[PDB]
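User: My notes are a mess, but here's the protein and calcium ion's SMILES. Can you give me a structure?
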Amino acid sequence: NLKVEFYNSNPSDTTNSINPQFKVTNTGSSAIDLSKLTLRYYYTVDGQKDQTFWCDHAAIIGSNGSYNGITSNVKGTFVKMSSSTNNADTYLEISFTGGTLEPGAHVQIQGRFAKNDWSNYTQSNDYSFKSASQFVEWDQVTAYLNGVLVWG
Ligand SMILES: [Ca+2]
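Assistant: No problem, the inputs look usable. Here's the predicted complex:
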């Protein structure tokens, strides 16, 4: 049982970097193994090029407010959709090398990706894009636990 909130920190239509911000909260009664959790951000690549993901900042915040920095545990991979839609031909898949999300805890992920030649994207044709001043509940990003959908 989890809740996913999301926004894009940089809303410019034309940009050389995309910055998905995720916050995932365990609203259930038992711990979740983060090594089994994946998150998807769907978009159109606007000219296929090699891409790279980095996490700017990620942390697991306990129910009491404890802080555990996990930035270097956050991995990103790019997956092509073999049948594209008008607003999705690729997703960034965010995964974790390890960690545990206790009941009432949340993990916040400040993601970033770019083409290796730093060429432009257009965000207006990206399914998952959400301009907001802060995290909002958003059902156009998805989450899977051990490959089983848990948000979306
Ligand atoms: Ca696009």
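Residues 37 and 145 are 5 Å apart (CA to CA).
User: Great, I'll file this with my notes.
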